[PDB]
Amino acid sequence: ITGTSTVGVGRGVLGDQKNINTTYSTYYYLQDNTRGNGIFTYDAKYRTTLPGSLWADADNQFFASYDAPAVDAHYYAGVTYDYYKNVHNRLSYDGNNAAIRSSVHYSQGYNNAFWNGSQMVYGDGDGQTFIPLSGGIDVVAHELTHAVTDYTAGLIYQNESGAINEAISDIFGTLVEFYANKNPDWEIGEDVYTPGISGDSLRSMSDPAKYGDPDHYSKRYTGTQDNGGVHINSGIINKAAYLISQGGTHYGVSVVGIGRDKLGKIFYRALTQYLTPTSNFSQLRAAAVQSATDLYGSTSQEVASVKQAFDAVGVK
Numbered sequence: 001i002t003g004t005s006t007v008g009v010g011r012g013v014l015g016d017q018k019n020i021n022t023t024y025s026t027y028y029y030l031q032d033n034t035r036g037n038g039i040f041t042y043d044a045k046y047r048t049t050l051p052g053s054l055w056a057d058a059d060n061q062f063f064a065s066y067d068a069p070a071v072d073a074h075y076y077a078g079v080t081y082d083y084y085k086n087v088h089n090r091l092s093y094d095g096n097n098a099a100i101r102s103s104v105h106y107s108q109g110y111n112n113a114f115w116n117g118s119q120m121v122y123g124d125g126d127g128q129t130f131i132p133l134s135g136g137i138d139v140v141a142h143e144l145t146h147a148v149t150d151y152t153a154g155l156i157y158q159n160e161s162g163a164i165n166e167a168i169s170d171i172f173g174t175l176v177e178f179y180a181n182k183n184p185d186w187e188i189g190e191d192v193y194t195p196g197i198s199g200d201s202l203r204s205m206s207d208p209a210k211y212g213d214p215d216h217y218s219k220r221y222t223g224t225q226d227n228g229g230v231h232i233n234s235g236i237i238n239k240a241a242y243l244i245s246q247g248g249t250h251y252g253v254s255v256v257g258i259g260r261d262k263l264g265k266i267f268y269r270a271l272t273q274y275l276t277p278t279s280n281f282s283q284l285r286a287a288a289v290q291s292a293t294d295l296y297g298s299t300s301q302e303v304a305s306v307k308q309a310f311d312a313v314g315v316k
């Protein structure tokens, strides 16, 4: 909407206070004009119609329970925008400052969040498996990274290309979590998963097998569930990315870590310059090797570590 840029204050899903960029015109709207062509957050009102209504508030204070998922969807979209702009010189998901739109309170008891090809969508969870999913910065950034993928490599959401698509979202969701630097880790969804269970998460990148996901190509899922295992076989690539950054020995293969920032540079270049809609895991390895070669040189430790990491997870 047309108005003037303002700064509200609210509390997120985990009870933390934060300032949010709003717009005033009669009401205060969750419309952040400071980033690209705007970040806009909507109320889906427990329905499945999208996007719902642009979030309007009478006083620019967002401390009600019902407000919390909107505060976090809006704020964490801003953090994710900042990460891509400041770290990768990418202006929003399309590289041209496309407006970022998110809807919260999607459906009833909905245990998921997703990018739908046009916008972000967040359920509130059922209160047992999940609390409102926008409370997880890694979840928000995972979603939005799907938008980046859609506009770049275009990885089809099935089989190996879909598992790469998912892993790319987990990698950058984690790197955004480190960027914000609030309790960062290599787990996915720990801030919103199972409020009644401490210390767990939806997935682990450092040890995917802790939740039954494969950590070696020989253990890949080959059936048809989950679009051919896109959230299962992602563990193989997540493990490789974790090893590139942090190092380790895995199935008797040693990997010298090169750190998160270089992981991000290598995978961002692979995603935006080398991957295609049907890339498989072997092609991802080649893309990462080439990206590291472009950035650091063919004889570099970075190239050697990328090769080590894919060797460790059985991808040639």
Ligand SMILES: NC(=[NH2+])NCCC[C@@H](N)C(=O)O
Residues within 6 Å of the ligand: 200, 201, 202, 203, 211, 213, 231, 232
């Ligand atoms: N038990 C647990 N914490 N996670 C299981 C599911 C992990 C991954 N396949 C998925 O996200 O579907």
Ligand SMILES: [Ca+2]
Residues within 6 Å of the ligand: 057, 058, 059, 060, 061, 062, 063
């Ligand atoms: Ca209010």
Ligand SMILES: [Ca+2]
Residues within 6 Å of the ligand: 177, 182, 183, 184, 185, 190, 191
């Ligand atoms: Ca964390």
Ligand SMILES: [Ca+2]
Residues within 6 Å of the ligand: 138, 174, 177, 184, 185, 186, 187, 188, 189, 190
């Ligand atoms: Ca995490």
Ligand SMILES: [Ca+2]
Residues within 6 Å of the ligand: 190, 192, 193, 194, 195, 196, 197, 198, 199, 200, 201
């Ligand atoms: Ca939990």
Ligand SMILES: [Zn+2]
Residues within 6 Å of the ligand: 142, 143, 146, 166, 169
């Ligand atoms: Zn995803």
